[PDB]
Amino acid sequence: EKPLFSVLRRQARRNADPSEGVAFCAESAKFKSVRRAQHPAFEAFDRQGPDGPSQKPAPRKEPPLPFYSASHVPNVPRPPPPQPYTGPLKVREG
Amino acid sequence: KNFKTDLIRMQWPAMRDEMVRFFQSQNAIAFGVLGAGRSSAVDVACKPWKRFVRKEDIQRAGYVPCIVEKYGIERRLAIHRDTLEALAFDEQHGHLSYLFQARLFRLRIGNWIEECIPTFVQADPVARRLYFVKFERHVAGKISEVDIPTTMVGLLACPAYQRGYHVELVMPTIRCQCVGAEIPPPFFVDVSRLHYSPPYTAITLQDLQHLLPADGSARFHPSYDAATQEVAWAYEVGSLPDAPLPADYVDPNFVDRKGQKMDVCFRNHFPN
Amino acid sequence: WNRNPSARYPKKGNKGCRPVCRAMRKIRKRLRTGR
Amino acid sequence: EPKVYRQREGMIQFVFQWGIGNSFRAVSANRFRPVHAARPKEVSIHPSYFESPHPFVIWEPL
Amino acid sequence: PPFRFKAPQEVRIKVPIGRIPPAVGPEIRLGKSIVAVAPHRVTAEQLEDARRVLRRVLGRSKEVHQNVHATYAVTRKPEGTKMGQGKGSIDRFVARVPAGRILFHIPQINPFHPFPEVEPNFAAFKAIAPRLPVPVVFREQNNFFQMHSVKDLIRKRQAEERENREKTARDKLGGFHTD
RNA sequence: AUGUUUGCUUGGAAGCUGUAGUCAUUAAAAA
RNA sequence: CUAAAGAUAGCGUGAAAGCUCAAAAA
RNA sequence: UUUUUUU
RNA sequence: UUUUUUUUUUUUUUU
């Protein structure tokens, strides 16, 4: 948080190609993925994320509130500006 | 000994067949009553929205204006009040139903058919009226977030309730991701087996997970936790523990005209 | 109750719904809007 | 007979920020009042739209 | 799991007398529910008396919940003050209850599904509606759908039996050919 | 209609001064 | 004649008796 | 110089 | 069911 006047240390980048688990199968003498088969849509959703520019808000986990609550009011009349992104960078194909 | 008994016993097999046949016939429509393999779609006609026409005019005329907007051009339609409200308010002593937003409307305009789902509804708080209803297209293969309602019809068969214990329905609706050509029907909570426990008793979504389509078209929200996401409770009245006020609580008595919080709420000396 | 003085006689046809010195006009509206 | 409406192949969704103009809004006096506010609108547009014929013409996304 | 959430606390701060804003949308609550029709002020004593009457009428086995809490403070001129000498001391607390807001509700679900011939019970709400300074209307929403109704099936069966009977009667006399 | 004035309070409590419970009738020359 | 009849909804008495209603039949 | 009550 | 309203200056309600 505090001010810094110096060149920041080198930060290693993160990959974009996660691993996968496979197991042998004698019924075809081949290695099959351990993940459960699903719809392409589901597969895509889980992997990348929601398809489209926008989506619906998240559902409620906790039980409802026994009394009314004005949850449709923002925290502040004037939200602060967005903060910069900080983290590992994507690795470009060589 | 009497002959009527004998006759009745002899005739019972025949009588059974009639009920069997009646239920079969009833079931035939799909080409039990509470089965998951039941469609819920509706088909209604519409009228075009004329140029230089206001909302008010249409409303006064006896119609509900609507528009259709995603995966296509913006289309304007008008649906009869007596036709729309009937679906909207499907209870004699109820308000806007949950099921209203969980269907597949096959609207017909001119020479075109649109398979849509209402998203946005503008209804009177007290009176039963519809001002404006928006629609969203549904295309096969695209993820569609839909809130499927739950039913607890089989409440009489509850040992807990029989014994005099209190039973509640926590979750009225469950979120799902529809990909298929049709929306799954309302879920049924089978409460026939719910015994009272000293601490508390509850039912989760893991039990109801078996009600989803076999083809895998529908799926619950990943955010949920089937191992801990309760849907129904069973406890004793006046035997609950004390808990503090939630941090995300907003007092409705300090809301501005604009929908903003009062200056007072930002003060140090502002409990809750 | 508010019934004696002349600032509470309703408008009749051809007055504009706001004659001189009226209070009930703004009282009823306010009442309905919230008391 | 009746037919099911189907969108054109290759179409995608796109959110237009700031706003969308028209004949009316073409006029300066008929412009938007808080000109720096955000007025997003979701519209379907072909990806090929974002292709200029001449190099001297470019498309600023922001 | 279930919890007994603590009620809010009154705010000991002088506030304006501004108007009551309207409601955003209709509030849906399972089971029986009582709501207002017009905006007005309600006092903590009024709400407490309504709660006591509801509890006495219903009994100790049923459960009830409150949806409105008294937090808005209001001042009053003490007896013995001049025209204008500043704001008066806090007098009482009221709750800004706009039209359509819910006051009380019983999540209890009618178990009697195959008995649509009987209207719901609103004796508890009747016992307190005269007390309230606002007009109230009873409400009871459930998960019951048209599709899942036995009335339709009964109707269908009656029709079928009628038809069958008619057919039989016509065929018996032999005034027309068969098949 | 009947077991049945079913039970505990109560000097006494029948369906009908309080409260708990709140189902039992059609069946053995049916195999 | 067949069918049906709440542990008991409204009267009544001193502890009782008695009547009526619901259900059933028509 | 009254209107309405589907099939 | 409608024409008839504070038409509450008087008569009149003649539909």
XYZ file of C-alpha atoms (C1' of nucleotides) in Angstrom:
721
model
C 0.000 0.000 0.000
C 2.698 2.427 0.983
C 4.567 4.477 -1.641
C 7.408 2.783 -3.493
C 10.272 4.415 -5.427
C 12.207 1.615 -7.103
C 12.134 -0.894 -9.931
C 9.892 -3.810 -9.014
C 11.306 -7.319 -8.982
C 10.798 -9.661 -11.905
C 7.546 -11.656 -11.887
C 7.185 -15.010 -13.629
C 4.308 -15.342 -16.117
C 1.545 -17.967 -15.913
C 0.602 -20.483 -18.586
C -2.799 -20.946 -20.213
C -2.691 -24.700 -20.912
C -3.811 -26.659 -17.844
C -3.131 -30.352 -17.434
C -5.634 -33.199 -17.481
C -5.978 -36.610 -15.876
C -6.184 -39.817 -17.903
C -6.415 -43.504 -17.032
C -5.859 -46.700 -18.985
C -8.831 -48.607 -20.406
C -8.489 -52.220 -21.549
C -11.853 -52.269 -23.354
C -10.104 -50.264 -26.091
C -6.432 -50.509 -25.006
C -6.317 -46.719 -24.788
C -5.982 -43.869 -22.303
C -9.304 -42.148 -21.578
C -9.828 -38.886 -19.719
C -11.099 -39.180 -16.154
C -13.428 -36.178 -16.460
C -17.128 -36.895 -16.816
C -18.658 -36.354 -20.233
C -20.866 -33.289 -20.590
C -22.489 -31.046 -23.146
C -20.180 -28.857 -25.239
C -21.931 -25.841 -23.830
C -21.222 -26.933 -20.292
C -17.658 -27.777 -21.155
C -17.120 -24.338 -22.595
C -18.839 -22.640 -19.702
C -16.719 -24.382 -17.128
C -13.502 -23.799 -19.032
C -13.668 -20.278 -20.394
C -16.778 -18.760 -18.875
C -20.180 -17.363 -19.751
C -20.703 -16.815 -23.467
C -21.673 -13.283 -24.365
C -21.036 -9.713 -23.287
C -23.292 -9.890 -20.258
C -25.155 -12.314 -18.019
C -27.563 -12.463 -15.108
C -26.384 -11.873 -11.522
C -25.331 -14.686 -9.189
C -27.891 -16.658 -7.170
C -28.484 -16.490 -3.437
C -26.749 -19.140 -1.335
C -28.042 -18.303 2.093
C -31.686 -18.664 3.097
C -34.021 -15.708 2.566
C -34.286 -12.906 5.119
C -37.265 -13.162 7.515
C -37.939 -9.422 7.094
C -37.731 -6.996 4.197
C -34.325 -5.510 3.395
C -33.571 -2.770 0.852
C -30.891 -4.788 -0.934
C -31.450 -2.852 -4.191
C -29.478 0.169 -2.896
C -25.767 0.618 -3.756
C -23.101 0.943 -1.067
C -22.326 4.574 -1.957
C -23.982 7.226 -4.148
C -20.734 7.585 -6.073
C -18.602 4.457 -6.540
C -14.825 4.807 -6.774
C -12.893 4.407 -10.019
C -11.760 0.940 -11.076
C -8.431 -0.336 -9.779
C -5.632 -1.539 -12.068
C -5.064 -5.203 -12.773
C -2.181 -6.866 -10.928
C -1.015 -10.402 -11.496
C 0.770 -12.942 -13.647
C 0.686 -12.195 -17.374
C -0.320 -14.506 -20.196
C 2.395 -16.348 -22.113
C 2.322 -15.788 -25.865
C 2.926 -18.633 -28.279
C 6.552 -18.829 -29.391
C -72.599 -65.293 4.602
C -73.613 -62.788 1.919
C -73.204 -62.796 -1.858
C -72.554 -59.076 -2.289
C -69.052 -59.474 -0.862
C -68.285 -62.278 -3.252
C -69.556 -60.293 -6.186
C -67.551 -57.226 -5.208
C -64.368 -59.320 -4.836
C -64.991 -60.938 -8.228
C -65.576 -57.558 -9.868
C -62.639 -55.667 -8.284
C -60.113 -56.775 -10.960
C -62.278 -55.315 -13.665
C -62.712 -52.079 -11.744
C -58.943 -51.661 -11.384
C -58.465 -51.741 -15.120
C -60.730 -48.745 -15.630
C -58.611 -46.561 -13.318
C -55.422 -47.855 -14.945
C -56.752 -46.989 -18.361
C -57.915 -43.565 -17.242
C -54.438 -42.716 -15.925
C -52.851 -44.069 -19.113
C -55.149 -41.957 -21.219
C -54.286 -38.929 -19.164
C -50.608 -39.651 -19.600
C -51.067 -40.039 -23.333
C -51.046 -36.282 -23.788
C -47.267 -36.205 -23.639
C -47.042 -37.592 -27.192
C -47.854 -40.160 -13.250
C -49.454 -36.754 -13.068
C -46.537 -35.446 -11.043
C -43.959 -36.815 -13.374
C -40.930 -34.954 -14.658
C -41.803 -35.768 -18.247
C -44.486 -33.178 -18.612
C -44.409 -30.152 -20.897
C -45.417 -26.664 -19.773
C -45.337 -24.496 -22.896
C -48.124 -22.159 -24.011
C -49.218 -20.839 -27.403
C -50.911 -17.456 -27.857
C -51.453 -14.994 -30.689
C -50.330 -11.375 -30.834
C -51.049 -8.156 -32.704
C -48.681 -5.714 -34.402
C -47.673 -2.418 -32.833
C -48.828 0.342 -35.154
C -46.726 3.415 -35.824
C -47.323 6.565 -33.819
C -48.840 4.544 -30.975
C -48.183 5.070 -27.269
C -48.174 2.561 -24.434
C -51.150 4.244 -22.854
C -53.306 3.889 -25.924
C -52.680 0.174 -26.127
C -53.244 -0.248 -22.420
C -56.550 1.566 -22.627
C -57.598 -0.453 -25.650
C -57.433 -3.574 -23.557
C -54.044 -4.951 -24.474
C -50.600 -5.360 -22.933
C -47.659 -4.084 -25.028
C -44.561 -6.297 -25.253
C -41.279 -6.471 -27.173
C -38.913 -9.280 -28.196
C -35.197 -8.425 -28.270
C -32.307 -11.060 -28.130
C -30.741 -13.155 -31.028
C -32.780 -11.192 -33.674
C -34.247 -7.794 -34.540
C -36.402 -5.898 -32.031
C -40.076 -6.839 -32.553
C -43.177 -5.209 -31.064
C -46.357 -7.094 -30.143
C -49.545 -6.704 -28.111
C -51.107 -9.480 -26.017
C -54.694 -9.403 -24.807
C -55.124 -8.589 -21.132
C -57.703 -11.279 -20.486
C -55.292 -13.785 -22.051
C -52.084 -12.653 -20.381
C -53.302 -11.874 -16.892
C -54.944 -15.279 -16.759
C -51.531 -16.929 -17.052
C -49.836 -14.334 -14.895
C -52.185 -14.640 -11.933
C -53.038 -18.348 -11.807
C -54.333 -18.224 -8.213
C -57.597 -17.054 -6.680
C -55.827 -15.373 -3.726
C -52.361 -14.815 -5.169
C -50.156 -12.350 -7.034
C -47.654 -12.673 -9.894
C -46.737 -16.357 -10.010
C -43.219 -17.747 -10.166
C -44.140 -20.046 -13.015
C -44.887 -17.078 -15.231
C -41.173 -16.562 -15.816
C -40.473 -20.263 -16.308
C -42.275 -21.112 -19.540
C -41.877 -21.158 -23.331
C -44.303 -18.760 -25.005
C -44.940 -19.587 -28.674
C -46.049 -16.138 -29.772
C -47.641 -15.873 -33.218
C -47.413 -12.630 -35.200
C -48.387 -12.437 -38.825
C -46.674 -15.380 -40.471
C -43.928 -15.915 -37.905
C -43.531 -17.897 -34.679
C -41.307 -16.775 -31.789
C -40.313 -19.078 -28.924
C -39.585 -16.672 -26.067
C -39.466 -16.390 -22.288
C -40.478 -13.327 -20.241
C -37.697 -11.694 -18.247
C -38.892 -8.237 -17.287
C -42.399 -7.634 -15.917
C -43.988 -4.352 -14.795
C -46.968 -5.176 -12.570
C -48.967 -3.114 -10.107
C -47.895 -3.606 -6.466
C -51.412 -4.032 -5.046
C -53.740 -4.542 -8.002
C -53.360 -7.389 -10.503
C -52.326 -5.620 -13.701
C -49.581 -5.759 -16.325
C -48.039 -2.602 -17.791
C -45.130 -3.908 -19.834
C -43.615 -7.373 -20.315
C -40.327 -7.908 -22.175
C -39.393 -11.181 -23.884
C -36.122 -12.951 -24.640
C -35.557 -15.448 -27.455
C -34.431 -19.015 -26.713
C -32.197 -20.814 -29.217
C -31.205 -24.447 -28.892
C -27.642 -24.908 -27.815
C -27.310 -21.621 -26.010
C -27.159 -21.565 -22.215
C -30.326 -20.035 -20.753
C -30.586 -19.232 -17.046
C -34.083 -20.128 -15.819
C -35.616 -20.288 -12.338
C -37.643 -23.501 -12.043
C -40.259 -23.416 -9.257
C -40.744 -26.068 -6.586
C -43.908 -27.782 -5.379
C -44.754 -29.425 -2.043
C -48.218 -30.755 -2.774
C -47.606 -33.915 -0.895
C -47.616 -32.262 2.459
C -50.288 -34.375 4.092
C -48.034 -37.417 4.083
C -45.401 -35.791 6.289
C -44.804 -37.599 9.602
C -43.341 -34.443 11.042
C -46.394 -32.424 10.130
C -48.652 -35.204 11.402
C -46.920 -35.113 14.762
C -47.594 -31.361 14.965
C -44.190 -30.011 13.914
C -43.695 -26.942 11.728
C -42.584 -27.367 8.111
C -41.297 -24.630 5.806
C -40.188 -24.253 2.190
C -36.924 -22.300 2.133
C -36.180 -22.197 -1.565
C -39.225 -21.416 -3.754
C -37.253 -21.618 -6.951
C -34.048 -23.314 -8.121
C -31.727 -21.866 -10.742
C -30.928 -24.004 -13.787
C -29.076 -23.742 -17.098
C -31.400 -24.908 -19.868
C -29.787 -25.810 -23.197
C -32.445 -27.982 -24.637
C -35.463 -27.171 -26.761
C -37.795 -27.192 -23.775
C -37.681 -25.983 -20.180
C -37.942 -28.668 -17.463
C -41.238 -28.651 -15.511
C -41.558 -27.558 -11.870
C -39.675 -29.684 -9.354
C -41.558 -31.820 -6.833
C -40.237 -32.075 -3.269
C -41.088 -35.578 -2.041
C -41.630 -34.907 1.662
C -43.201 -38.287 2.376
C -40.080 -39.258 4.335
C -39.153 -36.440 6.732
C -38.730 -37.324 10.404
C -38.308 -34.802 13.200
C -34.934 -34.542 14.934
C -34.082 -32.734 18.179
C -31.665 -30.197 16.670
C -33.220 -29.824 13.261
C -33.969 -31.659 10.025
C -33.468 -30.463 6.455
C -33.532 -31.585 2.814
C -30.842 -30.768 0.235
C -30.664 -30.587 -3.564
C -28.760 -33.905 -3.810
C -32.043 -35.825 -3.319
C -33.817 -33.732 -6.001
C -30.877 -34.076 -8.437
C -32.457 -37.342 -9.687
C -35.419 -35.346 -11.128
C -33.314 -33.718 -13.882
C -33.645 -34.883 -17.509
C -31.743 -38.068 -18.377
C -30.358 -36.482 -21.577
C -28.476 -33.951 -19.421
C -29.971 -30.863 -21.118
C -30.576 -29.144 -17.747
C -28.082 -28.668 -14.913
C -28.105 -26.798 -11.614
C -25.961 -23.740 -11.091
C -22.358 -24.680 -10.233
C -22.335 -22.039 -7.541
C -24.755 -24.091 -5.476
C -23.629 -26.856 -3.132
C -25.783 -29.982 -3.408
C -24.239 -31.345 -0.177
C -25.288 -28.257 1.866
C -27.874 -26.255 -0.153
C -31.038 -26.932 1.828
C -34.512 -26.525 0.273
C -36.778 -27.441 3.205
C -36.585 -27.373 6.993
C -38.307 -29.081 9.904
C -37.910 -27.666 13.426
C -39.821 -26.823 16.598
C -41.288 -23.348 17.046
C -39.651 -21.178 19.696
C -36.560 -23.370 20.017
C -34.129 -21.567 17.713
C -30.750 -20.055 18.622
C -30.004 -16.345 18.661
C -27.966 -14.811 15.838
C -26.723 -11.270 15.135
C -27.954 -8.946 12.400
C -26.416 -9.594 8.955
C -23.786 -7.138 7.754
C -25.516 -6.656 4.370
C -28.739 -5.338 5.945
C -30.120 -2.002 4.732
C -32.724 -0.081 6.715
C -35.711 0.660 4.420
C -36.628 3.686 6.578
C -33.624 5.759 5.406
C -33.960 5.566 1.606
C -34.054 8.679 -0.559
C -36.432 9.385 -3.414
C -33.660 8.500 -5.825
C -33.041 5.173 -4.238
C -29.997 6.176 -2.299
C -29.075 6.024 1.368
C -29.570 9.009 3.634
C -26.620 11.057 4.820
C -27.360 9.914 8.339
C -26.539 6.343 7.404
C -22.919 7.422 6.854
C -22.607 8.820 10.359
C -20.634 7.276 13.196
C -23.592 7.189 15.555
C -25.781 5.152 13.194
C -26.463 1.714 14.703
C -27.608 -0.894 12.192
C -62.488 19.809 11.334
C -61.840 21.943 8.237
C -65.379 23.094 7.203
C -66.134 26.755 8.211
C -64.013 29.202 6.082
C -64.299 30.029 2.365
C -60.849 28.681 1.380
C -62.284 25.116 1.246
C -65.374 25.429 -1.011
C -64.770 23.038 -3.983
C -64.227 24.365 -7.527
C -67.424 23.994 -9.675
C -67.330 23.684 -13.532
C -65.421 26.542 -15.341
C -62.951 27.577 -12.587
C -59.686 25.792 -13.535
C -59.494 23.603 -10.350
C -57.465 26.303 -8.529
C -59.509 29.347 -7.453
C -58.274 32.042 -5.062
C -57.198 31.002 -1.555
C -57.625 27.190 -1.587
C -56.096 24.618 0.761
C -58.144 21.442 0.284
C -56.700 21.015 -3.235
C -53.202 20.505 -1.840
C -54.525 18.731 1.257
C -56.254 15.859 -0.604
C -53.333 15.264 -2.961
C -50.922 15.184 -0.076
C -53.179 12.888 1.881
C -53.292 10.406 -0.944
C -49.596 10.695 -1.641
C -48.967 10.120 2.017
C -50.112 11.655 5.291
C -47.517 -21.922 -43.409
C -46.050 -20.388 -40.256
C -42.275 -20.436 -39.911
C -39.887 -20.042 -36.993
C -37.845 -16.837 -37.140
C -34.104 -17.482 -37.425
C -31.296 -14.933 -37.304
C -28.693 -14.646 -40.037
C -25.657 -16.896 -39.788
C -22.469 -15.361 -38.504
C -24.081 -12.782 -36.297
C -22.773 -11.977 -32.818
C -23.807 -9.870 -29.826
C -22.179 -6.514 -29.138
C -22.667 -3.862 -26.461
C -22.570 -0.299 -27.787
C -21.506 2.120 -25.041
C -22.153 5.876 -24.900
C -25.281 5.528 -27.020
C -26.753 5.026 -30.477
C -27.643 8.002 -32.654
C -30.408 8.655 -35.123
C -31.882 11.357 -37.311
C -33.146 13.223 -34.292
C -29.896 12.907 -32.334
C -27.883 14.032 -35.369
C -28.569 17.603 -34.348
C -26.284 19.195 -31.776
C -29.175 20.681 -29.831
C -30.705 17.157 -29.714
C -27.506 15.543 -28.363
C -27.205 13.760 -25.024
C -27.170 15.853 -21.835
C -24.552 14.098 -19.542
C -22.200 13.399 -22.521
C -19.672 11.399 -20.418
C -22.339 9.021 -18.862
C -22.569 5.359 -19.922
C -25.641 4.138 -21.853
C -24.788 0.579 -22.923
C -27.116 -1.208 -25.359
C -26.896 -4.808 -26.559
C -27.321 -5.197 -30.324
C -26.676 -7.949 -32.884
C -24.119 -6.985 -35.527
C -22.115 -8.921 -38.093
C -18.362 -9.057 -37.391
C -17.654 -7.997 -40.965
C -18.976 -4.509 -40.185
C -15.681 -3.671 -38.498
C -13.726 -3.616 -41.753
C -12.865 -0.393 -43.584
C -12.210 -0.452 -47.354
C -9.597 2.314 -47.347
C -6.530 2.422 -45.054
C -7.121 6.124 -44.361
C -10.358 5.074 -42.627
C -10.072 3.245 -39.295
C -12.394 2.262 -36.452
C -11.642 3.536 -32.948
C -13.211 1.009 -30.537
C -13.096 2.954 -27.320
C -30.075 -23.575 9.262
C -32.794 -21.561 10.988
C -31.838 -18.622 13.170
C -33.474 -16.010 15.400
C -32.216 -12.747 13.920
C -32.157 -9.785 16.295
C -34.427 -6.856 15.494
C -32.939 -3.437 14.632
C -32.392 -0.589 17.102
C -34.109 2.789 17.195
C -32.084 5.743 15.908
C -31.854 8.573 18.448
C -31.283 11.215 15.773
C -33.555 14.040 14.677
C -34.539 13.708 11.016
C -36.695 15.674 8.574
C -40.377 15.009 7.895
C -40.019 14.241 4.268
C -42.441 12.262 2.193
C -42.832 8.490 1.906
C -41.353 7.123 -1.344
C -43.276 4.592 -3.446
C -42.563 0.872 -3.653
C -40.218 -0.676 -6.203
C -42.221 -3.799 -7.007
C -44.649 -6.371 -5.616
C -43.310 -8.430 -2.716
C -44.088 -12.156 -2.974
C -44.257 -14.257 0.194
C -45.303 -17.877 0.524
C -48.245 -18.734 2.733
C -50.642 -16.222 4.203
C -49.677 -12.544 4.149
C -51.186 -9.179 5.123
C -50.310 -5.987 3.234
C -51.447 -2.364 3.172
C -53.006 -0.448 0.277
C -52.075 3.146 1.129
C -49.122 4.891 2.776
C -49.287 5.958 6.405
C -47.390 6.063 9.676
C -47.389 3.149 12.127
C -46.099 3.207 15.690
C -44.067 0.617 17.568
C -46.880 0.290 20.112
C -49.368 -0.405 17.316
C -47.116 -3.037 15.793
C -46.511 -4.656 19.193
C -50.243 -4.779 19.940
C -50.874 -6.365 16.541
C -48.155 -8.946 17.236
C -49.620 -9.765 20.656
C -53.129 -10.180 19.239
C -51.847 -12.364 16.394
C -49.906 -14.581 18.805
C -52.866 -14.908 21.184
C -55.261 -15.806 18.359
C -52.953 -18.273 16.600
C -51.535 -19.957 19.713
C -48.118 -21.107 20.864
C -47.700 -23.840 18.228
C -47.783 -21.595 15.141
C -45.007 -19.222 14.080
C -45.232 -15.620 12.859
C -42.764 -13.071 11.507
C -42.689 -9.279 11.244
C -41.710 -7.428 8.070
C -41.729 -3.792 9.287
C -39.728 -2.243 12.135
C -40.121 1.131 13.835
C -36.965 3.195 13.297
C -37.975 6.646 11.965
C -37.902 9.213 14.775
C -40.271 12.175 15.094
C -40.142 15.251 17.319
C -42.875 17.189 19.104
C -43.080 20.654 20.605
C -42.986 20.455 24.427
C -45.860 22.102 26.285
C -44.486 25.487 27.306
C -42.449 26.526 24.267
C -42.866 29.715 22.269
C -43.541 30.057 18.557
C -40.085 29.104 17.492
C -37.171 28.191 19.697
C -35.666 25.375 17.767
C -36.633 21.825 17.058
C -38.431 19.935 19.728
C -37.438 16.761 21.462
C -38.020 13.331 19.982
C -41.609 12.211 20.612
C -41.924 8.667 19.241
C -40.771 6.355 16.452
C -42.722 5.475 13.307
C -42.134 3.219 10.309
C -42.541 4.508 6.758
C -44.767 1.786 5.302
C -45.536 2.558 1.631
C -48.317 0.974 -0.404
C -47.766 -2.691 -1.219
C -45.334 -3.357 1.632
C -45.939 -6.499 3.688
C -46.534 -6.269 7.442
C -47.067 -9.845 8.649
C -46.962 -13.240 6.962
C -47.210 -16.912 7.874
C -45.089 -19.131 5.568
C -47.524 -21.963 6.436
C -48.709 -23.763 3.272
C -52.246 -25.060 2.917
C -51.960 -28.889 2.947
C -55.463 -29.476 1.711
C -54.772 -29.586 -2.023
C -57.710 -31.732 -3.116
C -60.193 -29.418 -1.399
C -60.506 -26.199 -3.407
C -64.047 -25.613 -2.174
C -62.910 -24.060 1.105
C -61.543 -20.527 1.357
C -58.432 -19.736 3.438
C -58.447 -18.629 7.085
C -57.998 -14.939 7.931
C -59.502 -14.690 11.413
C -56.177 -13.554 12.887
C -55.831 -10.761 10.324
C -59.494 -9.806 10.758
C -58.938 -9.449 14.510
C -56.298 -6.750 13.891
C -57.283 -5.047 10.611
C -59.657 -2.617 12.391
C -56.788 -1.698 14.697
C -54.463 -0.607 11.898
C -54.592 2.993 10.614
C -54.522 1.732 7.033
C -56.721 -0.490 4.869
C -55.403 -4.042 4.553
C -56.173 -6.955 2.228
C -55.692 -10.669 2.829
C -53.379 -12.727 0.630
C -52.290 -16.349 0.329
C -49.866 -17.519 -2.374
C -48.791 -21.131 -2.855
C -47.014 -23.375 -5.345
C -50.238 -24.848 -6.686
C -50.576 -24.814 -10.479
C -53.475 -25.370 -12.841
C -51.821 -28.292 -14.551
C -51.573 -30.132 -11.252
C -55.267 -29.796 -10.396
C -57.712 -32.649 -9.734
C -60.775 -30.602 -10.707
C -59.988 -30.962 -14.372
C -59.613 -34.723 -14.062
C -62.936 -34.968 -12.178
C -64.633 -32.930 -14.906
C -63.139 -35.073 -17.618
C -64.268 -38.271 -15.942
C -67.803 -36.911 -15.452
C -67.973 -35.983 -19.135
C -66.717 -39.374 -20.186
C -69.231 -41.190 -18.020
C -72.049 -39.017 -19.375
C -71.032 -39.779 -22.917
C -70.811 -43.474 -22.224
C -74.230 -43.516 -20.658
C -75.732 -41.643 -23.559
C -74.170 -43.984 -26.064
C -75.466 -46.997 -24.222
C -78.946 -45.559 -24.014
C -79.000 -44.791 -27.743
C -77.694 -48.251 -28.663
C -80.187 -50.108 -26.473
C -83.273 -48.887 -28.279
C -81.952 -49.848 -31.717
C -83.264 -46.762 -33.494
C -79.962 -46.388 -35.351
C -77.275 -48.664 -36.750
C -74.170 -49.675 -34.817
C -70.501 -49.038 -35.570
C -75.918 -45.978 15.532
C -72.273 -48.660 18.771
C -67.742 -50.472 21.610
C -67.904 -46.416 25.534
C -70.266 -43.278 31.235
C -62.987 -44.840 26.395
C -58.694 -41.490 29.763
C -56.364 -37.650 33.649
C -58.296 -33.267 36.727
C -62.878 -32.737 39.682
C -67.590 -34.000 45.282
C -69.357 -35.548 40.063
C -67.954 -34.744 33.840
C -72.597 -37.713 29.459
C -70.231 -35.868 22.283
C -71.588 -30.495 24.414
C -67.689 -25.634 32.144
C -60.568 -27.265 31.494
C -57.024 -30.212 28.869
C -54.402 -34.460 26.347
C -55.410 -37.990 22.576
C -58.314 -38.035 18.172
C -58.319 -44.842 15.302
C -62.489 -48.489 15.543
C -67.782 -51.539 11.837
C -67.808 -54.779 5.664
C -62.931 -60.940 7.428
C -62.664 -66.622 7.681
C -67.444 -72.724 5.191
C -60.474 -66.479 1.420
C -55.609 -71.562 0.493
C -85.410 -51.104 0.755
C -80.149 -49.786 -0.402
C -76.533 -46.391 1.126
C -74.300 -43.338 4.792
C -73.550 -41.237 9.828
C -68.017 -36.148 12.983
C -65.760 -38.593 19.249
C -69.651 -34.653 18.200
C -71.106 -28.619 14.611
C -75.640 -25.927 16.971
C -79.937 -26.307 21.321
C -81.308 -28.626 26.162
C -80.931 -30.606 31.860
C -79.050 -30.867 38.141
C -75.751 -35.642 36.938
C -79.325 -37.396 32.741
C -82.861 -37.707 28.849
C -84.468 -35.566 24.319
C -84.173 -32.654 19.439
C -81.526 -30.716 15.167
C -77.285 -30.403 11.686
C -73.181 -32.739 8.727
C -72.887 -37.494 5.808
C -76.222 -40.807 2.927
C -80.701 -41.885 -0.040
C -84.328 -39.552 -3.090
C -84.929 8.540 -30.973
C -82.747 3.863 -24.720
C -78.660 -0.233 -24.745
C -77.068 -5.255 -23.481
C -77.838 -10.768 -22.483
C -71.469 -15.851 -27.147
C -72.392 -20.723 -29.418
C -77.700 -1.576 -17.113
C -77.526 3.815 -19.080
C -79.058 8.901 -20.000
C -79.461 13.165 -14.385
C -74.293 16.375 -11.898
C -72.147 19.874 -5.818
C -78.633 21.085 -10.242
C -75.743 23.014 -3.156
C -79.224 30.562 -6.356
C -84.947 29.176 -7.134
C -88.885 25.911 -9.764
C -88.694 21.018 -11.685
C -87.221 15.731 -12.197
C -91.833 16.318 -16.631
C -87.416 9.527 -18.705
